[PDB]
Amino acid sequence: YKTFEVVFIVLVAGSLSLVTIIGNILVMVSIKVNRHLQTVNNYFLFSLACADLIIGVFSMNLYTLYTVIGYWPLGPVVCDLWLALDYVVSNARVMNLLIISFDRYFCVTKPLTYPVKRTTKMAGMMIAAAWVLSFILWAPAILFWQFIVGVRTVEDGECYIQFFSNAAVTFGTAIAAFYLPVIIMTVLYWHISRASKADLEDNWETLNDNLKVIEKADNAAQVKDALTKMRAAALDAQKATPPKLEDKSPDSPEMKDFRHGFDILVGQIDDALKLANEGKVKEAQAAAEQLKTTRNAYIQKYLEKKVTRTILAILLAFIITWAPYNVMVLINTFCAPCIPNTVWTIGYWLCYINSTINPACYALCNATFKKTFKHLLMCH
Numbered sequence: 001y002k003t004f005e006v007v008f009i010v011l012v013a014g015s016l017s018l019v020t021i022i023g024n025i026l027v028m029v030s031i032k033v034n035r036h037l038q039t040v041n042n043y044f045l046f047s048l049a050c051a052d053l054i055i056g057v058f059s060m061n062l063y064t065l066y067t068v069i070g071y072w073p074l075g076p077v078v079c080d081l082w083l084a085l086d087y088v089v090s091n092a093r094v095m096n097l098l099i100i101s102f103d104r105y106f107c108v109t110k111p112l113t114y115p116v117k118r119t120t121k122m123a124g125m126m127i128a129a130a131w132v133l134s135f136i137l138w139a140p141a142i143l144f145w146q147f148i149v150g151v152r153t154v155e156d157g158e159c160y161i162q163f164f165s166n167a168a169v170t171f172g173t174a175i176a177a178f179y180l181p182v183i184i185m186t187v188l189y190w191h192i193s194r195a196s197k198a199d200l201e202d203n204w205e206t207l208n209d210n211l212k213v214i215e216k217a218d219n220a221a222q223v224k225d226a227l228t229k230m231r232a233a234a235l236d237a238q239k240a241t242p243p244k245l246e247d248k249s250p251d252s253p254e255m256k257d258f259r260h261g262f263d264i265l266v267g268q269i270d271d272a273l274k275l276a277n278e279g280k281v282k283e284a285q286a287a288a289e290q291l292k293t294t295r296n297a298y299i300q301k302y303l304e305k306k307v308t309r310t311i312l313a314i315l316l317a318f319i320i321t322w323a324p325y326n327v328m329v330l331i332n333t334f335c336a337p338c339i340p341n342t343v344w345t346i347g348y349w350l351c352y353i354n355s356t357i358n359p360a361c362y363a364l365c366n367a368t369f370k371k372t373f374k375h376l377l378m379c380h
């Protein structure tokens with residue numbers, strides 16, 4: 001069985017590495033070739049995808065070589081470079097999530113000052129500062145500590161951070177590098193979700209979303225289920241007042257036009273409901289296209305939930321995939337035999353799995369990312 005276990009580990013490991021590489025490369029290229037995806041959020045996500053790509057290329061394969069062979073066969077120099085690269089990339093990831101969390105925090109708490117300062121240059125210099133700071137914090141201590149103490153205690157065939165010979169040092173470093181950032185991101189997101197928890201955006205977003213549901217419906221249930229809620233949010237959006245210019249009275253021509261547009265909209269919605277009841281569901285979908293026509297005909301009267309959802313998904317992926325290894329670091333301070341080598345391998349592999357899961361958290365949930373993906377994969 002042991003031979004089959006080795007073959008199985010090599011196969012699933014190469015599969016994970018390949019999926020990670022392909023996904024993150026698709027994200028990076030998609031941002032680089034589509035100017036509609038060249039936003040600050042996707043700059044942060046670009047850096048995150050770069051870190052995930054480095055994890056998928058270097059860390060995964062070399063760790064598989066390590067585990068499968070049973071010792072470190074490459075050498076001390078390559079071991080030092082691999083450790084330094086992995087920890088610098090990990091730290092850059094952590095501070096990247098910190099940058100995303102704080103950026104969203106200032107977006108939701110300072111709308112009058114921060115959005116105007118939120119350009120691609122500021123994001124670029126923040127990302128660059130994150131990478132440089134990570135490299136300065138991690139690289140010299142990993143590469144040259146052996147020269148500082150004057151002896152290399154990493155014996156032949158081993159690969160580990162030398163100054164992590166002490167368990168308490170490793171745990172303290174895990175507090176400075178993992179626990180405090182996770183707490184900070186948790187509090188920041190707490191303020192995000194409490195900030196999002198105004199009405200006009202919810203009604204309009206509901207109406208448009210249900211319109212898209214009617215357009216892409218498969219059976220006779222989704223069309224009506226989106227029709228009734230879309231009409232409810234339509235009337236609730238008609239009763240309220242949008243941000244009108246000059247603050248006009250309810251008897252003004254602008255308000256009367258605003259109500260009239262939703263009158264026509266509800267009328268055509270009821271026509272689509274009629275045609276949906278007679279058995280002409282296809283004509284009800286075309287009638288939904290008509291709803292889009294009149295909606296865009298009267299859309300000048302109008303002008304974040306999915307962004308908060310996406311951020312939460314990324315944060316939860318990181319925390320859930322990275323918590324076991326760090327609690328193994330916590331337990332290792334008082335009982336080293338309590339964590340076998342296999343469990344260490346499992347924690348390492350969850351940390352690496354974070355990079356494979358990341359693209360599915362923000363790219364497979366965005367329409368522009370999907371369209372750019374299919375453009376990249378189609379044969380020209």
Ligand SMILES: O=C(O[C@H]1CN2CCC1CC2)C(O)(c1ccccc1)c1ccccc1
Nearest residue numbers: 087090091094170173174177178325348351
């Ligand atoms: O979990 C951690 O690192 C993971 C990333 N790499 C190296 C060690 C593990 C698994 C793979 C991390 O909490 C950690 C690990 C060991 C000791 C101290 C901290 C960490 C490391 C660098 C930057 C941010 C966090």
